[PDB]
Amino acid sequence: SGFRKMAFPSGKVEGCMVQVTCGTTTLNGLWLDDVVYCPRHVICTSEDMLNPNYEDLLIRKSNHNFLVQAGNVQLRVIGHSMQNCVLKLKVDTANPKTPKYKFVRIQPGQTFSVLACYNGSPSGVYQCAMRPNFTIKGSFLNGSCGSVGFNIDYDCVSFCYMHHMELPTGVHAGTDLEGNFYGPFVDRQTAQAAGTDTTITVNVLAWLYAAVINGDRWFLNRFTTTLNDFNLVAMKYNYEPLTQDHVDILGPLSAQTGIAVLDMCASLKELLQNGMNGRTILGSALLEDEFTPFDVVRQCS
Amino acid sequence: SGFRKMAFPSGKVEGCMVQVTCGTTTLNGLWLDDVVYCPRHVICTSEDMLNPNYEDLLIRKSNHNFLVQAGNVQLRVIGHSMQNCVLKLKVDTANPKTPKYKFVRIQPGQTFSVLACYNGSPSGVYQCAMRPNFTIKGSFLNGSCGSVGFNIDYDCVSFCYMHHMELPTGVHAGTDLEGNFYGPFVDRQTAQAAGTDTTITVNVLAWLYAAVINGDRWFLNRFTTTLNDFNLVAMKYNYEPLTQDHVDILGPLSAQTGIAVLDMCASLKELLQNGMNGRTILGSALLEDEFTPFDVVRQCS
Numbered sequence A, B: 001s002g003f004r005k006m007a008f009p010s011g012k013v014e015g016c017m018v019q020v021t022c023g024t025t026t027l028n029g030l031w032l033d034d035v036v037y038c039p040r041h042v043i044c045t046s047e048d049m050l051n052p053n054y055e056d057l058l059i060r061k062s063n064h065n066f067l068v069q070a071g072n073v074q075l076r077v078i079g080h081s082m083q084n085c086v087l088k089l090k091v092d093t094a095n096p097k098t099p100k101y102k103f104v105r106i107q108p109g110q111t112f113s114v115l116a117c118y119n120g121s122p123s124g125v126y127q128c129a130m131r132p133n134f135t136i137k138g139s140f141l142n143g144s145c146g147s148v149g150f151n152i153d154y155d156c157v158s159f160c161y162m163h164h165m166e167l168p169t170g171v172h173a174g175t176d177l178e179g180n181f182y183g184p185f186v187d188r189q190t191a192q193a194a195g196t197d198t199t200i201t202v203n204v205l206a207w208l209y210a211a212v213i214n215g216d217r218w219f220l221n222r223f224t225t226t227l228n229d230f231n232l233v234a235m236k237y238n239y240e241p242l243t244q245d246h247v248d249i250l251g252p253l254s255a256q257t258g259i260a261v262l263d264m265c266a267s268l269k270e271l272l273q274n275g276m277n278g279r280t281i282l283g284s285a286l287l288e289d290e291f292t293p294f295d296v297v298r299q300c301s
């Protein structure tokens, strides 16, 4: 029994974190085979970031400008190239700890584990969800840039995130490992802001299922509803629309507990309308939306 | 910015999890040097759980009755000795992945990371606190016994918890790595129940300080309280007595934010009386008690 926000074991990814220093600025890099991946804004000074030409700034730099440290060992940069907003540093030595891995781009609403680091040193891991507004509510201090998010499926680490910046709201923005930003953001010191967030409905339902599995059943009721009526509710309460795919994805949970998705949607409907009436669900007074249906199934099986 | 329940990077513990089989029972073990540590109830059969005589069951076991499997490699057991409620199996091969480690018994209120494991294979990592009633609110399915809790202070892993069982209220009980249970629990399947839980007051206060540090001040007020008046009120909300030790421990967070400990105590007193009137603190709708003063300082600073 029990339900916790739960991250993938971070060992496979810890063995890929390196320190990358360029000039005064120093952040984290991901070392895979013989390449170190890190944010391209490592090559910028405070004035550069105001309006950077990265192609122009990068051609000025050369291999020797990048100090790359893998713990106490130094790594020698033999090549540097840019892909989108990540900088790729060719090193002389391949990482003997390279795991089986893929670069994947995730969808808003999907979850991943973040290995937050400082000076190429892993310090903590936590579970995140890519918000619908393409930010993540992480925990990052100065020095975290280049920290990565990932999922593990079988033996394979799926790298999906690299931390680039904090936004003025205190949330965070980054790219996939191919350097494509998540969300309408640019690696530049300008006025950037998170758009209005919404709640990940399928995830809230999944967590209500996780609640029922764990013995929290007070919010269940005799009613059922339809996608159309519910999405009217969802839209009213700043929840993402529920699609037919979401309902399919929630299939296993609806069978394992006997609560149909539209049946559970009636529960969430009443929760959205009348509130929680002083009670909690899985120890929370908020409707938790950072658990995917897969997350619920994997932790409850 | 951001405040998340952050676990420690689990890689150093992952390299220690093995599978221990005895008869038909398989659970997890911790492989450090040439010793595998696991719950002694692995040697219990169906008819044993009520009143097992562990010395009697163990005197009957040979070394080859213990199957220890480290990944695909089978470890050969060369001895076995029971220490309190943990079995210590001598294996012929030292763990090459053995980190810097030490065994510490923790006090209620302390936090640690849990690496949930099944079949000697790590499943997830999450952060926990030792509740005042000496249970923890974990996430454990059948097969996770021998999963361990730990902190990592400067590359040294301090093992502090081994999972042994789940009490009927859905919470969990275990031992330190010397096999001494936390709280009045025994590794017998007779009815035993956790004491009434309370809220870890010193932790809530640290987390309130964390909220000020991340720029949230709405819950402060102009009042103070004596220590004793605070405790007279907090007892009535099922909060842990706050001691001078707790007040001293918060001293650095008081000085960092400019708010005297007893002033923050007045704030909490009012929070308990008012609720939150629809606001949140660091994103939760309840007062969080699973961040320690040490945790707050290490995640914020």
Ligand SMILES: FC(F)(F)c1ccc2[nH]c([C@H]3CCNC3)nc2c1
Pocket (backbone or CB within 6 Å): A025, A041, A044, A045, A046, A049, A164, A165, A166, A186, A187, A188, A189, A190
């Ligand atoms: F938005 C963004 F791209 F993430 C960003 C914004 C400001 C930055 N300042 C720097 C270094 C040089 C001066 N301080 C560190 N890197 C930055 C990156």
Ligand code: NA
Pocket (backbone or CB within 6 Å): A220, A221, A222, A223, A224, A263, A264, A266, A267
């Ligand atoms: Na219903």
